[PDB]
Amino acid sequence: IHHQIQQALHFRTAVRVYKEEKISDEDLALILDAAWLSPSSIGLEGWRFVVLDNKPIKEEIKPFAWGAQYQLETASHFILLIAEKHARYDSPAIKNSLLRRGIKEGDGLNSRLKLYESFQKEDMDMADNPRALFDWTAKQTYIALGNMMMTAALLGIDTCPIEGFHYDKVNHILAKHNVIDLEKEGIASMLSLGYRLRDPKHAQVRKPKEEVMSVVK
Amino acid sequence: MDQTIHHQIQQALHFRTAVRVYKEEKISDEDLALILDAAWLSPSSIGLEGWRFVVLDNKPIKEEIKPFAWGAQYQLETASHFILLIAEKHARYDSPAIKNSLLRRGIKEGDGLNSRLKLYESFQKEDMDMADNPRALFDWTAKQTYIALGNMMMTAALLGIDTCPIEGFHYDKVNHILAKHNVIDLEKEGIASMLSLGYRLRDPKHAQVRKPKEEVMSVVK
Ligand SMILES: Cc1cc2nc3c(=O)[nH]c(=O)nc-3n(C[C@H](O)[C@H](O)[C@H](O)COP(=O)(O)O)c2cc1C
Numbered sequence: 032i033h034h035q036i037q038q039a040l041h042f043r044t045a046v047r048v049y050k051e052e053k054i055s056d057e058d059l060a061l062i063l064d065a066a067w068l069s070p071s072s073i074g075l076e077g078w079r080f081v082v083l084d085n086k087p088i089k090e091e092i093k094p095f096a097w098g099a100q101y102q103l104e105t106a107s108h109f110i111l112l113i114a115e116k117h118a119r120y121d122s123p124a125i126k127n128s129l130l131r132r133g134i135k136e137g138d139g140l141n142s143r144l145k146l147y148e149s150f151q152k153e154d155m156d157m158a159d160n161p162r163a164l165f166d167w168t169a170k171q172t173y174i175a176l177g178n179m180m181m182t183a184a185l186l187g188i189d190t191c192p193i194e195g196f197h198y199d200k201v202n203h204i205l206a207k208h209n210v211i212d213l214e215k216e217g218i219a220s221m222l223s224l225g226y227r228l229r230d231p232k233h234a235q236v237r238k239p240k241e242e243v244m245s246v247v248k
Numbered sequence: 249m250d251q252t253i254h255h256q257i258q259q260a261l262h263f264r265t266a267v268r269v270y271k272e273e274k275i276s277d278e279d280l281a282l283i284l285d286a287a288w289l290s291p292s293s294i295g296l297e298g299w300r301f302v303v304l305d306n307k308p309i310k311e312e313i314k315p316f317a318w319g320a321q322y323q324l325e326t327a328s329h330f331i332l333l334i335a336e337k338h339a340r341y342d343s344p345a346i347k348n349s350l351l352r353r354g355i356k357e358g359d360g361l362n363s364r365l366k367l368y369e370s371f372q373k374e375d376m377d378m379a380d381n382p383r384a385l386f387d388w389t390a391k392q393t394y395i396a397l398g399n400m401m402m403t404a405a406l407l408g409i410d411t412c413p414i415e416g417f418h419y420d421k422v423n424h425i426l427a428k429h430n431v432i433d434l435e436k437e438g439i440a441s442m443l444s445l446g447y448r449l450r451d452p453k454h455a456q457v458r459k460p461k462e463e464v465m466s467v468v469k
């Protein structure tokens with residue numbers, strides 16, 4: 032399993048140009064299962080993963096997506112990662128995550144809601160800052176993003192994680208096609224999936240591992 | 249199509265659960281190293297790698313964190329290893345960190361470097377609206393560490409190692425404990441999250457809950 036994992040870690044690279052060859056529906060389903068089963072802080076699951084097969088919408092997004100030109104053009108599949116806005120402790124979203132989990136009264140539910148108020152007001156210092164609340168739900172999607180990429184790599188499928196686009200212009204294109212509801216949510220990132228047209232030009236580059244990892248004994 | 253690999257991934261996805269109480273059994277050096285390699289080798293936006301992953305073995309520091317960590321009480325007590333995910337502050341387009349991330353990749357040659365800096369500038373000012381907003385910039389590097397969080401947890405799961413991702417602590421207070429011990433430079437970096445690792449004492453009583461998959465995943469066209 033070590034050699035296999037290590038092989039997947041070195042196989043995953045950010046590829047921009049893909050083969051025409053399409054990912055099977057079974058491989059695609061596995062990848063999305065990895066997203067769906069990902070853990071999210073407080074089990075909120077304030078996120079959605081959208082397979083964008085619609086070619087006109089891709090064409091509309093393209094001029095606003097500097098980091099995604101070739102991927103939007105060539106990728107087998109293109110996934111949008113959406114995060115919930117305004118997921119404040121006193122929101123229905125949060126209210127609904129407790130019920131889902133089998134929490135009820137308002138003395139087991141209003142109790143944990145007391146903790147979530149403390150968590151957002153004090154612990155993470157974000158309750159009264161909508162951008163920070165959005166950035167918090169958006170962070171959970173990066174967990175699913177890593178899970179999808181690792182699953183992909185273990186299947187020999189290439190990916191590219193993408194932030195290189197104008198967020199507000201992409202959000203409005205998505206809202207106008209009713210792909211998202213801009214009141215409730217906004218895009219966090221994009222992920223392309225496919226088979227690389229060719230081997231990467233330059234080798235994998237990272238900081239020396241000592242500048243990144245360490246032990247405090 | 250490749251059924252053996254599907255089974256292995258499917259086993260790991262259903263194995264992973266957020267584990268609060270661990271047994272005493274420790275993770276091997278080889279398994280911890282692979283897990284950390286998963287974080288190190290993770291992609292980050294623009295190749296910045298504005299992150300550090302620290303194995304917190306020191307028991308006194310764990311003991312000090314504990315009263316301010318409502319979500320990590322049994323994890324700090326019982327976990328085999330505990331990892332702090334640290335993100336860089338002030339990663340503005342014109343910062344030394346952003347410049348070094350280009351140099352690392354051999355980009356320097358006047359307007360290869362400068363031309364990228366110009367893209368990173370519009371990216372932070374216009375695409376993400378964060379160039380002049382240090383909290384947003386921090387949250388942006390902190391987002392990258394969640395990719396590593398994911399890769400670490402999947403690697404652990406494939407290894408049979410239980411895990412728990414942790415945000416349930418007072419960030420300012422924990423930051424101050426970490427700076428006080430010279431674990432971080434608070435002017436340059438801040439904690440993003442923690443991850444406990446180990447072997448579950450036992451399987452959970454209450455099976456995994458998720459939203460119906462139609463409420464999370466969909467296809468446009
Ligand atoms: C969240 C994040 C966003 C990214 N956005 C883009 C994108 O905008 N366009 C692109 O071509 N590559 C994008 N990438 C890929 C990075 O440039 C790449 O991960 C980095 O250069 C490290 O190299 P490697 O993953 O190929 O090993 C992104 C990576 C991360 C994780």
Ligand SMILES: Cc1cc2nc3c(=O)[nH]c(=O)nc-3n(C[C@H](O)[C@H](O)[C@H](O)COP(=O)(O)O)c2cc1C
Nearest residue numbers: 070071072073074265266319320413414415416456
């Ligand atoms: C970023 C993040 C932070 C989390 N923080 C905590 C924590 O502070 N304390 C805790 O007991 N569980 C924590 N969890 C675990 C979640 O409660 C758990 O992932 C969620 O309820 C889904 O259940 P499952 O992972 O067992 O499938 C966290 C999860 C995520 C991804």
